[PDB]
Design a protein around this ligand. Structure first.
Ligand code: OK5
Ligand SMILES: OC[C@H]1O[C@H](O[C@H]2[C@H](O)[C@@H](O)[C@@H](O)O[C@@H]2CO)[C@H](O)[C@@H](O)[C@@H]1O
Length: 513
């Protein structure tokens, strides 16, 4: 699908894509290879869909947090720069793009949210979130507002949610999710109260907050370094500072490393490597991008040394040190989707803060909890013996879901033995290659039909049936990847339905004898 002898690059529409196009022209100059830069809407959702069919761009730019998902699905080339090139970037930027011990992208720049304030309206910006309501009352008397920022993307509200204890995944334990704890609830409650008391509007998005700030209508916004060009042009007299504290604690922004990955399906891998190493990640390449939209604190030591002198970069790094680097683990995409929904529903009053963060916690935990139940059932079906290891967190849910599946799953395998044996004998499975192709059939058959617990038990029960065969033919090491792919089919295709059902609690209640 992907054409040979050219480079197609995807980058987000808030970055310096005209700058990047100029590095493209310089590459074409030396090589005769044309470089096309695109900025499609929702490119971070579209990349996995298209790349999975061997389509999409040669090079994808995004914050590192999505790249583990892409690498797990096999959508990225491993990159292998020599030590001399690795030595040119900060080791912590390389750590952001390492997944399962392998480098999966080139790091470009460190991005952290700051408080941006209009110095002609607000000579001393507020140190605390708690003083913002009074400050808004003062500014409303003068025909202005205290603060506007994008309430549609949870990236911008996260720093307040994290301040008093909210977290995605502890230190990374995927079993320990801190989305519906007291600290998260306190942060999101303060946000909702701001909206209730008319200090902010639930509909405010990127464009509205940017237009209000850049015209001098609002004293403050929250945004990253990419936003500074547009403010420069507007001749607002602005500062960039430390985010306000909440309950005496720093705001903790999720820090991104803008990263460039190479599509596994690209026939132009050596061209992409040459472009990124020898054109983009140079003093002149990054300057060309930075002068279009600021990158933040760049990975390339030589150029960071020049930029570090900027007090706006010093404030970006101060917010970065108080926050933490995003995980790159594959459930980051599921975490963001759940938290986005929670913020928008709490802000709009469609749900309470309690309902909203309960559902977000269920959504963030869904893959792990589903794998635990499905993996345990396939293994105990295969061997005749239950797993002794503790169930961990929500162990009650897992144990009861497993006990339910033992009753309802064994019933399906008993009543439909005829068809299950028929299908099994037809597939003639003898190795993990056979199992990988079995996976392909399953996704199609399961997605084709309607959504209910009966069809979900049937998928899992067929999995148990196949697992018993794999043990029988000394292919026991194939059972975990079978559990993984059934889990992936289930939570990818039925996420929203599963969350509406209260995940595996809904399963336990539905079949409660
Ligand atoms: C109230 O409802 C319930 C309450 C409690 C418990 C269960 C239910 C319930 N509720 C609903 C349904 C069912 C049972 O349904 C079946 C039981 C047995 C067989 C089929 C189905 C239809 C069902 O199938 C699936 N459901 C969900 N996920 C998948 S993934 C997958 C699958 C498919 C192929 C693979 F290679 C691997 C996996 C299938 C599947 C679909 C059809 C199948 O056989 C069709 C007939 N063939 C068999 C072979 N023979 C030689 C020719 C005729 C088989 Cl064996 C399977 C496993 C499948 C469905 O689609 O609804 N049960
Ligand atoms: O809103 C959730 C979102 O947060 C981050 O996306 C950022 C991105 O990192 C920045 O470079 C900038 O473009 O704004 C985005 C927020 O709109 C995560 O990187 C992303 O995966 C996640 O969905």
């Amino acid at each position: 699908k992907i054409e040979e002898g050219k480079l197609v690059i995807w980058i987000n529409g808030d970055k310096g894509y005209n700058g990047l196009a100029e590095v493209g022209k310089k590459f074409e100059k030396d090589t005769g290879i044309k470089v096309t830069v695109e900025h499609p809407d929702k490119l971070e959702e579209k990349f996995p869909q298209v790349a999975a069919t061997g389509d999409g761009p040669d090079i994808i730019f995004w914050a590192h947090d999505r790249f583990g998902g892409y690498a797990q699905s096999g959508l990225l080339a491993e990159i292998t720069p020599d030590k001399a090139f690795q030595d040119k970037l900060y080791p912590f930027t390389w750590d952001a793009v390492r997944y399962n011990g392998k480098l999966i992208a080139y790091p470009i720049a460190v991005e952290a949210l700051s408080l941006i304030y209009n110095k002609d309206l607000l000579p001393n910006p507020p140190k605390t979130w708690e003083e913002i309501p009074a400050l808004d009352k003062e500014l409303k008397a003068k025909g202005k507002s205290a603060l506007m920022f994008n309430l549609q993307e949870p990236y911008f509200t996260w720093p307040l949610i994290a301040a008093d204890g909210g977290y995605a995944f502890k230190y990374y334990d995927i079993k320990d999710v801190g989305v519906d704890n007291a600290g998260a609830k306190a942060g999101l409650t303060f946000l909702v109260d701001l909206i209730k008391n008319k200090h902010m509007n639930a509909d405010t998005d990127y464009s509205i907050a940017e237009a209000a700030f850049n015209k001098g209508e609002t004293a403050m916004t929250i945004n990253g370094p990419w936003a500074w060009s547009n403010i420069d042009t507007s001749a607002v007299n602005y500062g960039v500072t430390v985010l306000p504290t909440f309950k005496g604690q720093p705001s903790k922004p999720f820090v991104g490393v803008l990263s460039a990955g190479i599509n596994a399906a690209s026939p132009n891998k050596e061209l992409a490597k040459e472009f990124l190493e020898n054109y983009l990640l140079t003093d002149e390449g990054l300057e060309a991008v930075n002068k279009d939209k600021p990158l933040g604190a760049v990975a390339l030591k030589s150029y960071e040394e020049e930029l570090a002198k900027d007090p706006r970069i010093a404030a970006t790094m101060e917010n970065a040190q108080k926050g933490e680097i995003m995980p790159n683990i594959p459930q980051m995409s599921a975490f963001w989707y759940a938290v986005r929904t929670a913020v928008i529903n709490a802000a709009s009053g469609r749900q309470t803060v309690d309902e909203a963060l309960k559902d977000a916690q269920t959504g963030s935990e869904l893959y792990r909890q589903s794998l635990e139940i499905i993996s345990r059932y396939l293994r105990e079906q295969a061997t005749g013996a239950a797993d002794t290891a503790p169930m961990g967190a929500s162990g009650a849910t897992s144990r009861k879901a497993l006990e339910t599946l033992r009753r309802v799953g064994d019933g399906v395998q008993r009543n439909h033995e005829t068809a299950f044996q028929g299908m099994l004998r037809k597939l003639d499975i003898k190795n993990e290659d056979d199992v990988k192709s079995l996976s392909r059939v399953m996704i199609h058959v399961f997605s084709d039909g309607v959504t209910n617990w009966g069809r979900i038990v049937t998928l899992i029960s067929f999995g148990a049936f196949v697992a018993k065969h794999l043990k029988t033919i000394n292919q026991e090491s194939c059972i975990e990847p079978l559990a993984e792919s059934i889990t992936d089919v289930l939570v990818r295709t039925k996420r929203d339905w599963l969350v509406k059902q209260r995940g595996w609690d809904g399963f336990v209640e539905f079949f409660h004898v």
